[PDB]
């Protein structure tokens, strides 16, 4: 068919053209970290938490908004992607209030779990 071959951590998978990097990662079986992306809502690209490294690419792309093309090898657990996630969480938590004991979303917070 028109399906194209993309690699996630060296594992090949067929994806329809127009599929984002995040959707390919879900197809392989991994969940890219996210804060602003919702499947039922339009793509925004604000939180930059879904930043993932494409092999042989010097710039980290946003997996939620970047359509994937043939031949890409998505390095989700690479050092660059981990450092990008750590930086994004540090910036997110720089101005967050210390309200966890009084917050109504204590044990079900995406911020808490993704920071952990």
């Amino acid at each position: 068919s028109n399906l194209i071959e993309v690699f996630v951590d060296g594992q090949s998978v067929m994806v329809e053209p127009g599929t984002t990097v995040l959707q390919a990662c879900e197809k392989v079986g991994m969940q890219i970290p996210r804060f602003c992306y919702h499947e039922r809502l339009s793509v925004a690209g604000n939180c930059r938490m879904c930043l993932v490294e494409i092999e042989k690419a010097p710039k980290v792309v946003a997996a939620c908004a970047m359509p994937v093309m043939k031949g890409w090898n998505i390095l989700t657990n690479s050092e660059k992607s981990k450092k990008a996630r750590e930086g994004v969480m540090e910036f997110l938590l720089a101005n967050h209030p210390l309200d966890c004991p009084i917050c109504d979303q204590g044990g079900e917070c995406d911020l808490q779990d993704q920071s952990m």
Binding site: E79, K82, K83, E86
Partner: protein
Amino acid sequence: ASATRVIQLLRNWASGRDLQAKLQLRYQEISKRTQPPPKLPVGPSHKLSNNYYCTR
């Protein structure tokens, strides 16, 4: 302890050791129950840079 000399000699002879050298009752030689504040130094991963979590 507050023991007379004769009783001390009797105990030392009967036991065969010098009791007053090493007594089993605690006296003023113990530390005070009020102590100065501590400081408790921080650990090795308290750097402000070159401390990314993915490396440790």
